[PDB]
């Protein structure tokens, strides 16, 4: 492949790696807040079960 | 159908209608159990509010 072509794909792939880290962290945090509220409600009902 | 035959089934058909009334009572009991389940569902509903 042309080195200019290789440089362009390498640069893109780097940027894609970056967007991914941020997206994963945000998804994990939102999921965790929702999960904590869900778990408190799940606790009293779980004791009832 | 023979009237004797009809009289015999109507004894049994009336019995089946009584069984259906008993089943309706059972469904009401099931609804009451569902309502107890709904009262435990009530703590979850308070968390949701």
């Amino acid at each position: 492949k042309g080195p200019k072509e290789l440089e362009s794909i390498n640069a893109s792939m780097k940027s894609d790696i970056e967007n991914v880290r941020q997206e994963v962290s945000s998804y994990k945090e939102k999921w965790l807040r929702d999960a904590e509220i869900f778990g408190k409600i799940t606790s009293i009902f779980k004791e009832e079960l | 159908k023979g009237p004797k035959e009809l009289e015999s089934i109507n004894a049994s058909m009336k019995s089946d209608i009584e069984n259906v009334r008993q089943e309706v009572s059972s469904y009401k009991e099931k609804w009451l159990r569902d309502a107890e389940i709904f009262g435990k569902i009530t703590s979850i509903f308070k968390e949701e509010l």
Partner: peptide
Amino acid sequence: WRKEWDDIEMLMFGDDAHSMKKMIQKIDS
């Protein structure tokens, strides 16, 4: 009877939710 089955399903939904809480404790690690 279908309504009673749905109540049973909501209870089992609660069990699923408890399993989900255990799983969340697990993506916590």
